[PDB]
Design a protein around this ligand. Structure first.
Ligand SMILES: C=Nc1ccc2ccccc2c1
Ligand SMILES: C=Nc1ccc2ccccc2c1
Lengths: 344, 344
C-alpha cells in the first residue's frame, strides 16, 4: 500500500524542550539492523517503522522544506547515539541539544528551514515537494502540519486529488473535529467523494523518536479503516490505542494527568462497589455521575482557583474514609494525605 | 435560642453495621465531666454537644417513641466505655453490639421502639411526643426522620407551627432539594410565611457519636443563618463544613470516595499547571473541564463496566508521565501503578 507522509517535521523544538531522546528510534534501528533509523524524528521515524516493521511498500514524503533549507546534521555517528541509549541517553543528549540550538538560532522556521539527522532519501523514501503528486493513489495519508490556520489552506490544495476511501490522519497539531470539518467543507463533490474519506489520527502523544506509541481517534472513519490503522500502528509503533476522538485531547494534552487520576478513581470506585457491596454496575455509575458532574459544576461555578474557599478539602476526610475498602484502598490513602495538607 | 430536636434515633443499625463506636461522645463526655454523654447517639449526642459546648440552654426532643417502647440499655457502665475508647474501642464495642442485636431482634422499629443507653431526660432535655409543641417558638429545628415518603406527612403536621425565620435542618435521610420542596408546598401562607424559613442541613456524615463533624448545605438559607449554624456546629461538633447543597450527596454518600479522588486530582493538576507552567488559572480550568466532561460522557455512553473496552487504561501511561511534576507528582505514581495493573 501507498503511504503519503505530508510534512517531515523539524527537530528544533524537540531539542529546545530539553527533555527528549531517541529511545524508540534507536530501538527500531536495532530491530531492523539499520543504524540510520536511530536519529530519525517525527514523521520520518513513523515512516521508517511502517516500512520496516509493518511492511508498507511505497513511502513518499512531501514537504516544501526539501527544496528550501533542509539541513542534515552529520556531527554525530549513528552508532554513538545507539550506544548511549542502552545505558543512559543523557551522556549524549546535551551536545545534540546544544548543536541543534546553535543551528536553530539562525535557521528559518519550517517550511523554510528544518533540522534532521538522517535524510529521508537514505531510508528509501521517495521525496517530493508537490503535495498533490504525493497523495495521488495514496491509501494512507499521514499529515503533520503546523498548528493553526494554515492547515485548511494546505489541505484544500490536494483534497480533490485524494483517493476515495483513503485513510487520512492528523497528529498533535489540530483536534480531530477541526480536521474533519476541512474535509466536510467539500462533502457533495461527486467526482472524488470526500464523504467516503476515513478521517482519523496517528498521534504519537510524545515525540515519536522517543516513545513507541500511537493514538487513533474513532468517530469519523469506518470500523474497517480503524482496525487496519490499529493493526499497522500496533506493528509499527509497538503500543497502539484506539479511542473516541473526543478523548484524544483529554488523553494526549496537558490534562492527561487529570484524565489519568480521574479514570483510575472511576475504575477503582466501580470495582469496590460491584465486588465488595455486590451492587450492579448501574448503581456505581449512577453515584459516580452525580459525583463527577457536581465537582465539575463547582469548578465552573467558582473557578478552579477558588474551589477550597467553597469546598473545604478536609470535608472529604471524615466521609470518604468509610469507602476505603476494595480497589479504592489502593488510591484513597494517597488522596487522604493530599486532602490533609490542603484542608482549611 | 430554643432548639427542637425532632427524632431521637435508634441505635440498632449503628450496632448492626459492626463498625461504629462512641469516640466523639466519649470525648465530649470527658470535656464536660459528664459520663452519661459517653453513650448518647444520633441526635442526643448532637443536642448534648449543642447544650454543653455551644451554650444552647433550651432543648426539647420530640419523638412518638417516648410513649412507646423507648428502651434504655443499662448493661454497660459509662466509665468503662470512656476507658475503652482512650486506647481501643474494640475492647468493648463487640459486647455492646451483641447486646443491641439481641434486643433489636424482637423490638419493633421506630417510632414503635428505639434503643438508647442514656435517656434524654437525664441530660436535662424537655421530652415530648408532640412535634407541634416542640417547634412552637423554636429558633433551630433539627429533623431526624425516617428515609422516604413519611417525611412530608410528618412535616405537614407542624409546618404551620414553625416560627418565621427559623432555621430548619435535615440530615442523611433526605436530599436538601426534596426537604426544601416540602416547605415550598406551603409557600404564600400569610401568617406562617414559610418562604422566610432558613432551610439547610445538620448532617454528621457518619454516626455523630463516632465522629465530631457536621455538613451544612448552602443554597436555601440566608447567609446569616448559614454563618450562625456554622459557628454553632464548629463549637458543638468540632469540625464544620458548609457547602453547596448540590455537593452534600457527593461529599457524604457512597460516592464520597470518588469525589475525594477527583477533587484531589483537580487540585494537584491545577498546581502543577499554575505553579510550574506559569499560566493563568483559566488555562488550567479549560483543560480540566474538557477532561472531566469527556471521561464522564464516555462513562454514560458505554457504561461504567465497559470503559476499558473503549479506553485502554494503558493509554494514559505514555502521556500522563510527561505531567509527573509539581503537586501532581504526589498522586501520579500511585495512579500509574493502578493503570499498569489494568491495561489491555
Ligand atoms: C509536537 N510536540 C509535542 C511534544 C510532546 C508532547 C507530549 C504530550 C502531548 C503532546 C506533545 C506534543
Ligand atoms: C445513618 N446512617 C449513616 C451512617 C454512616 C454514614 C456514613 C457516611 C454517610 C452517611 C451515613 C449514614
Amino acid at each position: 500500500m501507498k503511504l503519503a507522509i505530508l510534512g517531515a517535521g523539524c527537530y528544533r523544538t524537540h531539542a529546545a524542550s530539553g527533555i527528549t531522546n531517541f529511545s524508540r528510534a534507536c530501538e527500531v534501528a536495532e530491530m531492523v539492523g539499520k543504524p540510520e533509523i536511530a536519529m530519525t524524528h517525527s514523521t520520518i521515524t513513523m515512516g521508517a517503522e511502517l516500512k520496516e516493521l509493518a511492511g508498507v511498500d511505497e513511502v513518499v514524503v512531501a514537504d516544501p522544506v526539501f527544496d528550501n533549507q533542509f539541513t542534515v546534521i552529520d556531527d554525530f555517528a549513528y552508532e554513538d547515539v545507539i550506544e548511549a541509549h542502552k545505558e543512559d541517553p543523557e551522556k549524549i543528549m546535551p551536545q545534540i541539544r546544544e548543536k541543534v540550538n546553535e543551528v536553530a538560532k539562525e535557521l528559518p522556521k519550517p517550511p523554510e528551514g528544518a533540522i534532521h539527522f538522517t535524510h529521508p532519501e537514505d531510508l528509501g523514501f521517495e521525496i517530493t515537494t508537490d503535495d498533490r503528486e504525493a497523495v495521488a493513489d495514496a491509501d494512507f495519508i499521514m499529515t503533520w502540519f503546523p498548528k493553526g490556520d494554515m492547515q485548511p489552506d494546505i489541505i484544500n490544495k490536494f483534497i480533490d486529488d485524494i483517493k476515495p476511501g483513503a485513510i487520512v490522519t492528523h497528529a498533535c497539531t489540530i483536534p480531530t473535529t477541526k480536521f474533519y470539518k476541512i474535509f466536510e467543507q467539500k462533502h457533495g463533490d461527486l467526482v472524488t467523494k470526500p464523504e467516503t474519506l476515513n478521517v482519523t489520527s496517528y498521534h504519537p502523544g510524545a515525540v515519536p523518536e522517543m516513545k513507541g506509541q500511537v493514538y487513533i481517534a474513532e468517530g469519523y472513519a469506518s470500523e474497517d479503516a480503524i482496525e487496519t490503522l490499529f493493526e499497522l500502528g500496533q506493528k509499527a509503533r509497538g503500543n497502539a490505542y484506539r479511542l473516541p476522538a473526543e478523548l484524544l485531547g483529554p488523553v494526549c494534552d496537558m490534562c492527561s494527568a487529570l484524565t489519568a487520576i480521574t479514570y483510575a478513581g472511576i475504575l477503582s470506585y466501580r470495582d469496590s462497589v460491584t465486588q465488595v457491596l455486590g451492587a450492579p454496575a448501574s448503581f456505581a455509575q449512577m453515584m459516580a455521575k452525580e459525583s463527577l458532574e457536581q465537582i465539575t459544576a463547582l469548578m465552573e461555578k467558582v473557578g478552579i482557583d477558588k474551589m477550597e474557599e467553597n469546598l473545604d478539602p478536609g470535608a472529604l476526610l471524615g466521609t470518604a474514609d468509610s469507602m476505603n475498602f476494595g480497589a479504592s484502598a489502593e488510591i484513597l490513602p494517597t488522596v487522604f494525605e493530599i486532602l490533609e495538607k490542603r484542608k482549611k
